[PDB]
Amino acid sequence: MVNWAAVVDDFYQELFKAHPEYQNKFGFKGVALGSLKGNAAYKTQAGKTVDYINAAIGGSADAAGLASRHKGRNVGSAEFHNAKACLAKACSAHGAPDLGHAIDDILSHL
Numbered sequence: 001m002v003n004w005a006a007v008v009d010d011f012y013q014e015l016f017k018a019h020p021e022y023q024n025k026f027g028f029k030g031v032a033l034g035s036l037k038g039n040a041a042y043k044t045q046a047g048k049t050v051d052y053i054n055a056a057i058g059g060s061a062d063a064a065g066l067a068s069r070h071k072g073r074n075v076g077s078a079e080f081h082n083a084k085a086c087l088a089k090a091c092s093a094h095g096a097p098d099l100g101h102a103i104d105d106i107l108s109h110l
C-alpha cells in the first residue's frame with residue numbers, strides 16, 4: 001500500500017522549511033524539524049492528515065468542512081497553494097500519485 005505516512009512526513013518537512021511561520025499555528029510550535037517525529041502533537045496531526053488523504057482517495061473527504069476549519073485558523077487559499085506545491089514534491093519523492101485534485105477540491109471552498 002502507498003506509504004502515505006512517509007509522504008505526509010516529507011510534506012510537512014517541505015511545508016515548514018519553506019514557511020516556518022506556519023508551524024506556529026500548531027501544538028508543535030517551536031520544535032526542530034528533525035524532532036517532529038518525536039513530538040506527540042505532531043504525531044496526532046500527521047495522522048489526521050494521512051486520514052484526510054485516504055478519505056480523499058476513498059471518496060469520503062469533506063473538502064468543504066476541511067476548508068472551513070482552516071479558515072477558522074486564518075489559513076486560506078494562499079497557504080493551500082503553497083501546500084499544494086509542497087505535497088506535489090512529497091508525492092513525487094515517494095513515487096506516489098499526485099494529490100493536486102484533492103487540494104483543488106479544498107481550494108474550491110477557500
Ligand code: HEM
Pocket residue numbers: 022023025026027045048049052053069070073075079080083084087103
Ligand atoms: C495539504 C494541505 C493540508 C491538509 C490535507 C491539511 C489537513 C488538516 C487536517 C486533516 C486537520 C485536522 C482537522 C480536524 O481535526 O477536524 C488540519 C488542521 C490544521 N491545519 Fe491543516 N492541512 C493542510 C494544510 C495546512 C496549512 C498550509 C496550514 C498552515 C498553517 C494548516 C494549518 C492547520 C492548523 C493550524 C490546524 C489545526 C491544528 C490543531 O488543531 O492544533 N494546514 N489540517
